[PDB]
Structure formats: structure tokens, C-alpha cells
Amino acid sequence: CPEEIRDQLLDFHEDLMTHCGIELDEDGSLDGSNDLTIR
């Protein structure tokens, strides 16, 4: 099977949110606070 058992690969889709683009699209995806306690 693929890596993700659920449907496809990751987070219900890739080329959506944070991971296909990480040069600054991750940096845009990490928008504000309240993502982790290390903030």
C-alpha cells in the first residue's frame, strides 16, 4: 500500500497545503502563533 493507509499519501491530498512547496509556501503556511509550544 502507499505510505498513508487512509486514502492516498498525506493529509488527504498533496500539492495543497504545505509540503509540495517548502521554499516559502511552508513559511506562508506557518501563518501565525498557536501551532506549537516552541513558539
Curated annotation (Swiss-Prot):
It is found in: Sarcoplasmic reticulum membrane. Disruption phenotype: Embryonically lethal. Embryos die at about 10 dpc, due to defects in heart tube development. Cardiac myotubes display enlarged rough endoplasmic reticulum and cytoplasmic vesicles that contain high levels of Ca(2+). Signal peptide: none annotated. Channel activity is modulated by phosphorylation. Phosphorylation is increased in failing heart, leading to calcium leaks and increased cytoplasmic Ca(2+) levels. It comes from the Eukaryota. Highly expressed in heart, lung, cerebellum and brain. Detected at lower levels in adrenal gland, stomach, thymus, esophagus and ovary. Homotetramer. Can also form heterotetramers with RYR1 and RYR3. Interacts with CALM and S100A1; these interactions regulate channel activity. Identified in a complex composed of RYR2, FKBP1B, PKA catalytic subunit, PRKAR2A, AKAP6, and the protein phosphatases PP2A and PP1. Interacts directly with FKBP1B, PKA, PP1 and PP2A. Interacts with FKBP1A and FKBP1B; these interactions may stabilize the channel in its closed state and prevent Ca(2+) leaks. Interacts with SELENON. Identified in a complex, composed of FSD2, CMYA5 and RYR2. Belongs to the ryanodine receptor (TC 1.A.3.1) family. RYR2 subfamily. Cytosolic calcium-activated calcium channel that mediates the release of Ca(2+) from the sarcoplasmic reticulum into the cytosol and thereby plays a key role in triggering cardiac muscle contraction. Aberrant channel activation can lead to cardiac arrhythmia. In cardiac myocytes, calcium release is triggered by increased Ca(2+) cytosolic levels due to activation of the L-type calcium channel CACNA1C. The calcium channel activity is modulated by formation of heterotetramers with RYR3. Required for cellular calcium ion homeostasis. Required for embryonic heart development. The calcium release channel activity resides in the C-terminal region while the remaining part of the protein resides in the cytoplasm. This is Ryanodine receptor 2. It comes from Mus musculus.
